[PDB]
Design a protein around this ligand. Structure first.
Ligand SMILES: *[C@@H]1O[C@H](CO)[C@@H](O)[C@H](O)[C@H]1NC(C)=O
Ligand SMILES: *[C@@H]1O[C@H](CO)[C@@H](O)[C@H](O)[C@H]1NC(C)=O
Ligand SMILES: *[C@@H]1O[C@H](CO)[C@@H](O)[C@H](O)[C@H]1NC(C)=O
Ligand SMILES: [Ca+2]
Ligand SMILES: [Ca+2]
Ligand SMILES: [Ca+2]
Ligand SMILES: [Ca+2]
Ligand SMILES: [Ca+2]
Ligand SMILES: [Ca+2]
Ligand SMILES: [Ca+2]
Ligand SMILES: [Ca+2]
Ligand SMILES: [Ca+2]
Lengths: 397, 128, 265, 264, 265, 272
């Protein structure tokens, strides 16, 4: 994999730096490296493809080195360089496309696309130029086990779940108490609703708690926490648990009192936030506990007192909401984001070349079913395909 | 007939294990027509009526036959106008009638297999 | 199959809507109309029940599911009602001079009450919330109440002299009494003819449906004067005959059964 | 990346610009009524706000599909992009927000107004089709969350509004069989293009090249040019993404990035 | 100008609200009032019409845009009401004995009915939906119905003995009958002095405006006993004279015409 | 509720609900007229209430309901209280009546009406029985064959029918479950109802004041159980009985439990 990254990087730096008129003192090292790579490749015959609509291509490398006599560059040098670089670029692209699609549960880190198993040999070791990217750095660290980290902007760690829970239910669904939550991508919108405005509850107070358990630890997360969740703040017709019948939901938004947000890690608490709204931090956490309360306003004007009566009809249902967006984060493992295209590249390749479903990835590589079960084998294969997809994106975006 | 039917249930739940497997698999490859099923009665007790009609006049009032008729009419109306296909809310990429979910994966699959119960008595099978 | 326990339930939103439970709930349920004798009088027929049943049969309700139970008067019905079916419909005639009576009847049947008994001669009772009312049924109730003070002396009434009491009900067949909550009362009641029970109002009963056949909607279910609400199972019609009313009830029975729902208890 | 794609285009090859939250949609808030009246009391239609990188569409029926066949009403929205995109990462959700509260909207001719009091249900028979040259490419049915589109010039969102066949009293009292209809059934969908890749150049929520360009022009008071509109309103400048405009935009964005590499 | 078709309309949300068509719609439209004879009786003035016209002239409505059309009684008005204007107002007195007839009048004029004829001597008719009713006009209509079964035989009635039929009306000038939808009915009617028409209630008529003068709002337009709605053009007032009522109408004629809207059909 | 319940064996035994259930519940005794007659006092009820007030039961929670006779009590018993105690005098000639009473009150019945004249009914399981209440019930029954004709009795000649009850106020009838019976009952004076026997009623407590424990609730003669809330005293007076009840009321309420199914004032549920 290191040699694949080095191939992509030296080819990028070649298509960038090698241009007419430039000074050989700036690309002497890259040219020595290119010649070394040509020497390490000349005499090999690789194959690529044969799974799905991928064509079976055979690559033979018989090229000529680049002279170091020149002191400035010209078109009869650039054009040779380009006619030699295009072949390596197509080779690397086909390799990455033959590698993003293969899976295995037995040592998924160990490379598939056997041409790459060969390139991982010891005579091909003379091509490593610099492992400078985040993904290749973390790959190397993992191979030499050490505390890795991937930095993410709006990570997609929460599988799509939009569901309720009623702690006081009735067939007619006329006096309810419960909590609704939507957990999607980087956002959690939760809302505790009481139809009786906490009239029969002690002290005119009703508790609500939402516990979320992440499948992978996160650190140094920047979070935006606000009140008055939006998607549960308008009229609604929702189904029952068994889906047979429906009930109505006309919300009226109040403010959370006694709010407490607890970011915990292995059940022990790490960070705690009381009534702090806006931009906050969480340094290490695998669990979130949002515990708020609905407190009946003791002093009420006529117009609002005419909405919460002492009787069962309850044509307005008091709600208390909370939005929580993970803007930035850091993770020991690999995830998806709103900034990078690795998953898009992978899924697009698979949809294009009609790859059957394998023993590891779900059908269509849906992030919900792929994050809900983030087992070590799936995590390893995901790291592998994301790394090689990044490698391919460095050249062909 | 509740006590007699319970007695017969007990007779079934005590003869079931006394049934054999080899000969049952041998018998399950036999096109046992109406005559083959109603001639070998224990004694043809006394000049019985037309047993095919006797059983059918109860058979065509039940869940099985009504579900057959429902499958029929829900392919028929669906092929006639596009309201039923468009309404049955299939998983995707076709809804003729079959991929219908009245009531996640588990749920859909159970709901679909309760329709596949008719594939056996629809000649859409290949095996046992 | 747990009973008597309240457990959190859970579901989802990507679940699809199931099929129409109507045309099966009809067959597996029962319906009971409560019509006044004036209806049968105006009709002047004896096959109208079977006629309505054969009509209902076209809506889906089978023959032996629908029942018609006559009541001579609102107050006679109010005297010890027993509504035991799976769907109850009541056709209520409007009467200004029976407004509070047919409001108490509505508050009694529409809602579900948890009732304990009362021994006036022994104990002195009090209300705890706005739902613990005192309901008295019988032929002619004549109720009087004396609130007492911290030291169980009377307030503007004499514990001995029954005549000093404050009469709140005069020869009524059904009384629903809400008094000041937080004081101990002592009662005088014609117990030979009326039985009184301390009843706490629970959530509504969704099994019965009142239909005011005549005038404007006046029923004030909630004893408190501020809300004065109106629910789904409190309907209204304008009438000059009764055949038309029964045809309308029949034709819009599905709307009624949609407005109603079987009992939780 | 910019100078690289420039050199590629000069040496013709398949380029790519990686965009995060691209402002490719022109601001367009608008409705479409398929059953209208003068008094605007029983309506069926669809309303959409296409803004920057996001779309919020919502199909509304005031009758809750009482007269329609099978108690179902169909709504379709066909967004036809100006340039192709690839490896788009998209976030699709139900129950669009900004079309979910009371509203007072003027008609097409701006002559009279009408009220809109929605009640959000879930969209059933939902189908999202990413098409290219009319050939469908990607199809999704009932899949919400993070999804992918590999090559598309058109999007077709086709959902339905289904009357619940079983209803409790509190919700049956909202959908009567008469014309007043003071509660209007709605079904919504939000769709955000979080990241994508394009063979052309656009604006984003990450880069300031467009802002540097427009700031230079506002500062030095340049007259309106023959190609770009006045003030470089991205709405009217993406509405007609002609090749001349695309070339000049690539050019000014490139030199703006070049200047930003020095002065910030 | 594609009439007879219905096409998708489109627009936007950036256009501004245009000018006020008021002070022009009054001029290019017409207003017709329907007052009761009791009003002019109490008044006893010959120039009250010119007075109200000169008063409208201040609000903007010109002289010959206003029309007054008397009616001796609510029933005589219900007898073939022919409302042909661009804005109709109808002042309606309350009478608890006329409630059903003045509610049928409301359900007839407030809405726009698509009316097909009917012939009782030949056919037997059935209803298909809940809005396909039978409206009978005339001087004295006496309507009797016998429902039939699947095999064309009566239910509690005989297809020869008209006395066994079920009576829903008795000497009424206007009737609106809804019956069980799905069953054929045989009818007896005084065809000589009454015409019956099978009509379907379409969307409402936004061109008329009923103004009750007396009692509380009771009009149940929707025949189904679940809605009991109060439309926007269903106004109430409390009265002791009539000049005050006409002055109120004239002073608040703009809110009235805003509650009304020129027709579609 | 069809959902499951979960628990753990590490938790702690919480404090006593006694001394609060006494305050937020009600108790109701059913004593015979004989007891008040032997006592010959008028304030004995207020006395017992002031005595309960020491045991914790507040003033307005205890009630007394006189019943002239066991049979008059069995005639439509309307038990509406959160805790019911019954004092029941033994009598060999009333053994079956006070066993039917026990089977009626200790258990929770789900009743439907029975129309004798137009239809004929049968029993399905050993818990579906026919209970008749009124002033004087006399029940005769004829079981029928497959072709709707009698068996040792004539469908017309009512004297041919087999008499199962004579001059009884309460009758519980269990017949062969699986054949159709034709009944003859004094409908004018006794109403009969087809009632299924659900689980028990934990709200009542029978106390046999005299003879040994003979009540066989379960109609099958193979269990003859002795439930927890089926007690026995030996008596020579009534004041000692009431003092015993008052001093050991805590054990009684520990042996009883509030109902689970629903709220209802009568001795059974109705479902038409
Ligand atoms: C669901 O309801 C429709 C309309 O009543 C009916 O046509 C259909 O058969 C029902 N579904 C089933 C499975 O019976
Ligand atoms: C609309 O009203 C404004 C302000 O009263 C006025 O300036 C304008 O001229 C009006 N429009 C027309 C077309 O006259
Ligand atoms: C329960 O009993 C223990 C022991 O007497 C006592 O310490 C504790 O306070 C009691 N619980 C409560 C809630 O009072
Ligand atoms: Ca009263
Ligand atoms: Ca009170
Ligand atoms: Ca006094
Ligand atoms: Ca009339
Ligand atoms: Ca009708
Ligand atoms: Ca008749
Ligand atoms: Ca007995
Ligand atoms: Ca005999
Ligand atoms: Ca038995």
């Amino acid at each position: 994999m290191d040699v694949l990254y080095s191939l992509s990087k030296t080819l990028k730096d070649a298509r960038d730096k090698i241009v007419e008129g430039t000074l050989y003192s700036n690309v002497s090292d890259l040219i020595q490296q290119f010649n070394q790579m040509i020497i390490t490749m000349n005499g090999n015959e690789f194959q690529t493809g044969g799974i799905g609509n991928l064509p079976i291509r055979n690559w033979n490398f018989d090229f000529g080195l680049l002279g170091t006599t020149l002191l400035n560059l010209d078109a009869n040098y650039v054009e040779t360089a380009r006619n030699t670089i295009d072949y390596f670029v197509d080779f690397v692209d086909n390799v990455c496309m033959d590698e993003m699609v293969r899976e295995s549960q037995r040592n998924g880190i160990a490379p598939q696309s056997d041409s790459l198993r060969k390139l991982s040999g010891i005579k091909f070791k003379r091509i490593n130029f610099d492992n400078s990217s985040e993904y290749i750095e973390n790959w190397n660290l993992q191979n030499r086990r050490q505390r890795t980290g991937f930095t993410f902007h709006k990570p997609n760690i929460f599988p799509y779940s939009a569901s309720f829970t009623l702690n006081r239910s009735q067939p007619a669904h006329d006096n309810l108490m419960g909590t609704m939550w939507l957990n999607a991508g980087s956002e959690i919108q939760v809302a505790g609703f009481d139809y009786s405005c906490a009239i029969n509850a002690p002290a005119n107070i009703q508790q609500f708690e939402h516990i979320v358990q992440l499948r992978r630890v996160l650190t140094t997360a920047t979070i935006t926490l606000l009140p008055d969740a939006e998607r549960f703040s308008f009229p609604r017709v929702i189904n029952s648990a068994d889906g047979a019948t429906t009930w109505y939901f006309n919300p009226v938004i109040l403010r959370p009192n006694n709010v407490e947000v607890e970011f915990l890690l292995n059940g022990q608490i790490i960070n705690t936030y009381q009534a702090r709204f806006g931009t906050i931090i969480a340094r290490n956490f695998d669990t979130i506990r949002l515990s708020f309360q609905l407190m009946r306003p003791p002093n009420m004007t006529p117009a609002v007192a005419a909405l919460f009566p002492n009787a069962q009809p309850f044509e307005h249902h008091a709600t208390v909401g909370l939005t929580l967006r993970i803007e930035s984060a850091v993770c020991e493992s690999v995830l998806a984001d709103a900034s990078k295209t690795m998953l898009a590249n992978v899924t697009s390749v698979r949809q294009e070349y009609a790859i059957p479903v394998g023993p590891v990835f779900p059908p269509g590589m849906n992030w919900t079913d792929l994050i809900t079960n983030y087992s070590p084998s799936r995590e390893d294969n995901l790291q592998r395909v994301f790394t090689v997809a990044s490698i391919r994106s460095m050249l062909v975006k | 007939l509740e006590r007699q039917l319970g007695e017969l249930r007990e007779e079934f739940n005590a003869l079931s294990q006394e049934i054999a497997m080899s000969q049952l698999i041998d018998l399950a490859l036999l096109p046992l027509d109406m005559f083959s099923m109603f001639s070998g009665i224990k004694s043809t007790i006394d000049a019985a009526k037309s047993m095919a009609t006797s059983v059918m006049k109860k058979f065509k009032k039940s869940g099985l036959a009504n579900s057959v008729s429902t499958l029929t009419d829900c392919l028929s109306d669906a092929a006639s106008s596009i309201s039923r296909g468009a309404s049955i809310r299939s998983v995707g990429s076709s809804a003729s009638c079959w991929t219908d979910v009245s009531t996640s994966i588990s749920t859909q699959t159970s709901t679909i297999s309760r329709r596949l119960r008719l594939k056996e008595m629809a000649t859409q099978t290949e095996g046992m | 199959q747990n009973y008597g326990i309240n457990l959190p339930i859970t579901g989802s939103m990507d679940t699809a809507y199931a099929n129409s439970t109507q045309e099966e709930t009809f067959l597996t349920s029962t319906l009971c109309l409560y019509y006044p004798t004036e209806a049968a009088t105006e009709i002047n027929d004896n096959s109208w029940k079977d006629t309505l049943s054969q009509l209902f049969l076209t809506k889906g309700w089978p023959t032996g599911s629908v029942y018609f139970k006559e009541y001579t008067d609102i107050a006679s019905f109010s005297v010890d009602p027993q509504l035991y079916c799976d769907y109850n419909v009541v056709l209520m005639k409007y009467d200004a001079t029976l407004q509070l009576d047919m409001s108490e009847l509505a508050d009694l049947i529409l809602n579900e009450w948890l009732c304990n008994p009362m021994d006036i001669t022994l104990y002195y009772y009090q209300q705890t919330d706005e739902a613990n009312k005192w309901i008295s049924m019988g032929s002619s109730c004549t109720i009087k109440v004396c609130p007492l003070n911290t030291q169980t002396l009377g307030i503007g009434c004499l514990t001995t002299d029954t005549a000093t009491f404050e009469e709140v009900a005069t020869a009524e067949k059904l009384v629903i009494t809400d008094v000041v909550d937080g004081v101990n009362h002592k009662l005088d009641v014609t117990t030979a003819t009326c039985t009184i029970r301390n009843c706490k109002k629970l959530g509504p009963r969704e099994n019965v449906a009142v239909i005011q056949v005549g005038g404007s909607d006046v029923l004030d279910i909630t004893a408190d004067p501020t809300t004065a609400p109106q629910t789904e199972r409190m309907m209204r019609i304008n009438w000059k005959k009764w055949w038309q009313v029964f045809y309308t009830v029949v034709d819009y029975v599905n709307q009624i059964i949609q407005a109603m729902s079987k009992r939780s208890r």
